[PDB]
RNA sequence: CAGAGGUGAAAUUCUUGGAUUUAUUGAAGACUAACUACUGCGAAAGCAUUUGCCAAGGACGUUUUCAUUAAUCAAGAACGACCAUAAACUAUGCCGACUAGGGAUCGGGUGGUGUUUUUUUAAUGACCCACUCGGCACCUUACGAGAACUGGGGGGAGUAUGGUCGCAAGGCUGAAACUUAAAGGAA
């Protein structure tokens, strides 16, 4: 086994009525990996702990990513796809790119799209799940998709439009097949 | 009873590094990266390559006399992705499966703390 | 071109083990390789600069120090033992990322203080603004003059805790987290302030060696050893 | 802006993800995605010259259940 | 010790004169992560590490003072020979001389009377509640003529064309004055 591992994130207060609901499903989905987890509702935190029966050494890292995904407000059937080996997170940072607030919110809304079309087409092409929240961009997926969405988001905070990247993603799929 | 090294797994995209040193970090015991086990030049980051690299790491650590490793798992960090590649969990799993005991897994990627982007 | 042929470099390697200072609990922390003690770079001066990063849980037996790694600097070699001294302290990154939450303020301070020895230390501090029980507004921000006053009393009382300590006294002071209790008691007149921590201690300059002071930190020892039998 | 396949994929990205690598191009799109995709294209083409009281005819739903449909959807 | 970048794969590049990785330390130029908000400040462009100095500013409090010193804007003023750079790109809404509100939040003030605070060193908090002034927004309501870096043709979707201006076909090449070689094409 291992000695002990313990990670903890702490979640904002409005999430607790959702996390209280889904929490038994988290205990099922982690007790099949032999990882304990507590949901503290007074200090507002979620901890995961490697118990005495954990033979997978690396799964406590994915449990850490799962609980901070739950804190960063992705839902549960989306977030338990992080406990499998082919999938990981990325948290792109978009705040430090441009100066004025008007150009920042217009490029970030351009990253989302009209009716959400640009973002949904990006999720479809990269096979990822992308959340444009605040001044960062969360993403879950395979690593090729994560590389693709990171370059898409950073070049969208630079001045080139994201539908150029969506076009070249379609071209590259029909060019790779 | 255990003798402890440290693991220093640096798992970027495009490559993984499984590099056991001593408890200080000054003396190395079998650095073998992912791209030197099997190279198609694109499978360097793959879980198979990380498992091969961690397996002959654990061979040379059992040769020298290290029974357990403290795992320090880092990504490329900096002004970049901060997420460990597909090889980090595979190298950790192969290090544990090949006899070495695991202790103290910690995430030491360089968060850039106000970086040099623009 | 032509590269090199290998000759196995673990036949010339020597194993030392690291004895921690006696300001801790159980003091055998592990072992360390070095090249074999030849003339022209003896091993006892191939060492003496190495710092090791150990866990305070491994140094103290408990698990509420599972964060808060520390650094021990090798100073004096005797008899296949590396006697160490305190070299610094640092949190793991996951601890302060687990502490930072939005809708509060983090007040962080730091002071560069010279102790009762001539070690000069840059010592840090973090503190997060709590909300009281019965508080119904979701914010609990400090009004930034409360931040300046809190940071002022943090700097004053922790530069009072140093200069009034040696390195061994300061280390034994910050093992059971009691400078944090001093900050909390001295600051609850201004803002509530959950989970104050020290988080980071850096050595900047160190005075001299003073083998007597190091051996008084550890314990005595002197050898008359074996004799050749011809 | 005058790429047709790209913009069709953009505005039919939602129901492709609702009724699904993925397929998007016609000659590979299986049933309910195909029916609603073709219906969306025909609506968008016919909304230029056709009358606004004749292009988008609502399905006849009774009052007390269409209002409840709207209230639950707005919730 | 034999590879490291990087890519969808590659490559330019670095590398047994030891790259990449690891540890200790130094130097440089930037930048101020998370905290970071439909929050704050600024006339706007804009402004995020600590501490100090320099002047400034706003809101509040005021049984202080002056006594019409005021409001709007054309004109004008302030701010906005070396090393080479991006901006917009799907958007929104009914306006003003205009009534009331509601929840949340930022700064000040008054009152209440509980908990954190606490004591004969100075003063000074935090939260809860009501009221009130002033802000950044948001969600609603009721009621009004709201008239009197410059250059522009005329709707949208199409259809026809014995007009005008163009561009475009033939037909094995060689190969025409020559029924002509080699070689190539096609089948």
Curated annotation (Swiss-Prot), chain A:
Entry's Gene Ontology BP terms: endonucleolytic cleavage in ITS1 to separate SSU-rRNA from 5.8S rRNA and LSU-rRNA from tricistronic rRNA transcript (SSU-rRNA, 5.8S rRNA, LSU-rRNA); maturation of SSU-rRNA; ribosomal small subunit biogenesis; rRNA processing
Q: Which effect does the record note for changing residue 61 to S? A: In temperature-sensitive mutant KRR1-18; grows normally at 25 degrees Celsius but fails to grow at 35 degrees Celsius
Give the chief site where it resides: nucleus
The organism sits in which domain of life?
Answer: Eukaryota
- Localisation: Nucleus, Nucleolus
One GO cellular-component annotation of the UniProt record comes to:
small-subunit processome
User: Quaternary arrangement and interactors, per the entry?
Assistant: Component of the ribosomal small subunit (SSU) processome composed of at least 40 protein subunits and snoRNA U3. Interacts with snoRNA U3. Interacts with MPP10, KRI1 and with ribosomal proteins RPS1A, RPS4A, RPS4B, RPS8A, RPS8B, RPS11A, RPS11B, RPS13, RPS24, RPS25, RPL4A, RPL7B, RPL8, RPL23, RPL25 and RPL28.
Protein name from the UniProt record: KRR1 small subunit processome component
Range covered out of full length = 35 to 211 of 316
Curated annotation (Swiss-Prot), chain B:
Q: Which Pfam families match?
A: Ribosomal_S11
Give the superkingdom in one word: Eukaryota
Give the UniProt keywords, A-Z.
Acetylation, Cytoplasm, Nucleus, Ribonucleoprotein, Ribosomal protein, Ribosome biogenesis, rRNA processing
Q: Which InterPro entries match?
A: Ribosomal_uS11, Ribosomal_uS11_CS, Ribosomal_uS11_sf
Q: Does the keyword rRNA processing apply?
A: yes
- For this chain's UniProt record, which GO biological process terms are given? cytoplasmic translation; maturation of SSU-rRNA from tricistronic rRNA transcript (SSU-rRNA, 5.8S rRNA, LSU-rRNA); ribosomal small subunit assembly; translation
Identify the GO cellular component terms for this protein.
90S preribosome; cytosol; cytosolic small ribosomal subunit; nucleolus; nucleoplasm; small-subunit processome
Keyword match Protein biosynthesis: no
- Coiled-coil residues are none
Explain the post-translational modification: N-terminally acetylated by acetyltransferase NatA.
A molecular function GO annotation? structural constituent of ribosome
Q: Where in the cell is it found?
A: Cytoplasm; Nucleus, Nucleolus
| Function text | Component of the ribosome, a large ribonucleoprotein complex responsible for the synthesis of proteins in the cell. The small ribosomal subunit (SSU) binds messenger RNAs (mRNAs) and translates the encoded message by selecting cognate aminoacyl-transfer RNA (tRNA) molecules. The large subunit (LSU) contains the ribosomal catalytic site termed the peptidyl transferase center (PTC), which catalyzes the formation of peptide bonds, thereby polymerizing the amino acids delivered by tRNAs into a polypeptide chain.
NCBIfam families assigned to the protein according to its UniProt record, in alphabetical order: PRK09607.1
The entry's other comment says:
Present with 29600 molecules/cell in log phase SD medium.
Q: Which family does it belong to?
A: Belongs to the universal ribosomal protein uS11 family.
Q: What is this protein called?
A: Small ribosomal subunit protein uS11A
Q: Which gene encodes it?
A: RPS14A
Swiss-Prot record, chain C:
Q: Name one GO cellular component term.
A: cytosol
Where does it localize? Cytoplasm
Q: How is it modified after translation?
A: N-terminally acetylated by acetyltransferase NatA.
Which terms are listed as keywords in the entry? Acetylation, Cytoplasm, Isopeptide bond, Phosphoprotein, Ribonucleoprotein, Ribosomal protein, Ubl conjugation
The family database entries (InterPro entries) matched by this protein are listed as: Ribosomal_eS1, Ribosomal_eS1_CS, Ribosomal_eS1_euk
Coarse class of the primary localization is cytoplasm
- Which GO terms fall under biological process for this protein? cytoplasmic translation; maturation of SSU-rRNA from tricistronic rRNA transcript (SSU-rRNA, 5.8S rRNA, LSU-rRNA)
Q: What is a GO molecular function of this protein?
A: structural constituent of ribosome
- Cross-referenced Pfam families, in alphabetical order? Ribosomal_S3Ae
Family stated for the protein in its record: Belongs to the eukaryotic ribosomal protein eS1 family.
Task: Mention any additional remark.
Answer: Present with 92400 molecules/cell in log phase SD medium. There are 2 genes for eS1 in yeast.
Q: What does this protein do?
A: Component of the ribosome, a large ribonucleoprotein complex responsible for the synthesis of proteins in the cell. The small ribosomal subunit (SSU) binds messenger RNAs (mRNAs) and translates the encoded message by selecting cognate aminoacyl-transfer RNA (tRNA) molecules. The large subunit (LSU) contains the ribosomal catalytic site termed the peptidyl transferase center (PTC), which catalyzes the formation of peptide bonds, thereby polymerizing the amino acids delivered by tRNAs into a polypeptide chain.
The protein here is known as Small ribosomal subunit protein eS1A
Q: Which gene encodes it?
A: RPS1A
UniProtKB/Swiss-Prot annotation, chain D:
| Leader sequence residues | none
Q: Where in the cell is it found?
A: Nucleus, Nucleolus
Q: How does it assemble?
A: Interacts with KRR1.
Function according to Swiss-Prot or TrEMBL: Required for pre-rRNA processing and 40S ribosomal subunit assembly. Seems to act in the processing of 35S rRNA at the A(0), A(1), and A(2) cleavage sites.
Please state what the protein is called. Protein FAF1
Q: Which organism is it from?
A: Saccharomyces cerevisiae (strain ATCC 204508 / S288c) (Baker's yeast)
State the organism's lineage: Eukaryota, Fungi, Dikarya, Ascomycota, Saccharomycotina
